[PDB]
């Protein structure tokens with residue numbers, strides 16, 4: 001698998017998502033994640049929701065295998081229905 005982190009909240013609560021992906025990339029030994037800056041690549045909150053395929057307005061966004069998940073709790077959920085059950 002491969003995870004991507006798009007942009008930043010800064011809010012500790014949401015940041016749990018990034019921490020989670022990273023920690024998971026210690027717990028599991030296949031899937032790398034990568035973090036990506038909207039400030040480097042130049043992507044809007046609009047773009048994000050466009051590409052994501054829905055009006056996501058919470059941040060961060062994390063994609064897994066090029067698929068938009070959503071925020072922290074989405075990412076927990078996705079790792080559930082895919083891996084943890």
Ligand SMILES: *SC[C@H](NC(=O)CC[C@H](N)C(=O)O)C(=O)NCC(=O)O
Pocket residue numbers: 009011013014015057058059060071072073074
């Ligand atoms: S301030 C951080 C907020 N995002 C998240 O925490 C990620 C998803 C969480 N499930 C949450 O939203 O509950 C955020 O982006 N807030 C924007 C704002 O409306 O405050």
